[PDB]
Amino acid sequence: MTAVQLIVGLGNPGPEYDQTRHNAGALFVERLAHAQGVSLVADRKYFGLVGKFSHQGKDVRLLIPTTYMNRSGQSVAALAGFFRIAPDAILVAHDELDMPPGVAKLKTGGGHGGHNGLRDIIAQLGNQNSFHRLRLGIGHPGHSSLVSGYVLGRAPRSEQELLDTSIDFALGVLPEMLAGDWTRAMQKLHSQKA
Numbered sequence: 001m002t003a004v005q006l007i008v009g010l011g012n013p014g015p016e017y018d019q020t021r022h023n024a025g026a027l028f029v030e031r032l033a034h035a036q037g038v039s040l041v042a043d044r045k046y047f048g049l050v051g052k053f054s055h056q057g058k059d060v061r062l063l064i065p066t067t068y069m070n071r072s073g074q075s076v077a078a079l080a081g082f083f084r085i086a087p088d089a090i091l092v093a094h095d096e097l098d099m100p101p102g103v104a105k106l107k108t109g110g111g112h113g114g115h116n117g118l119r120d121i122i123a124q125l126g127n128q129n130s131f132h133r134l135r136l137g138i139g140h141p142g143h144s145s146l147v148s149g150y151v152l153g154r155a156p157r158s159e160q161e162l163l164d165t166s167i168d169f170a171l172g173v174l175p176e177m178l179a180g181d182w183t184r185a186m187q188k189l190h191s192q193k194a
């Protein structure tokens with residue numbers, strides 16, 4: 001019923017953060033943008049890289065913030081603000097510690113689950129958590145004190161391959177995601193085994 005107008009892929013900027021676990025969301029958008037032949041334009045006005053393509057008469061935008069992970073909302077709020085976009089027309093792809101590599105799922109609203117990027121977004125939007133989330137599994141290190149370094153590290157070859165499989169499964173349900181039909185999008189996704 002509500003078309004997706006903005007896709008956001010979270011990550012940290014700089015070479016020392018590239019290809020790391022924390023940048024799964026950004027990688028998804030980066031791969032989604034390449035499949036569509038969309039160009040990511042550096043725009044200081046919105047604090048990140050912006051992309052645009054049409055789908056059913058409406059403009060769908062792609063965004064990778066270039067502020068830090070914890071100031072991401074600023075960028076999201078800057079773009080949603082200028083284009084008057086409702087929170088529920090927004091999909092944010094991100095790394096999810098709670099599921100293992102090779103697994104991806106969808107979710108509407110909810111907590112930020114300690115994720116600092118998600119958390120700034122809810123704040124900057126005026127406490128709107130009503131948006132959508134593509135959760136790309138990266139696995140858990142086993143303990144809470146090891147989390148900060150685990151997400152800021154590059155994964156072994158076997159693990160990346162599973163993530164690569166999951167980003168592929170996800171683009172596979174893009175037609176269903178752009179339309180905003182989440183129950184089918186979930187039904188087609190949630191049953192793919194890596």
Ligand SMILES: O=C(O)CCCCCC(=O)O
Nearest residue numbers: 095096097113114115116
């Ligand atoms: O718990 C999640 O949704 C994803 C986790 C990686 C979390 C890191 C963070 O706060 O940057």
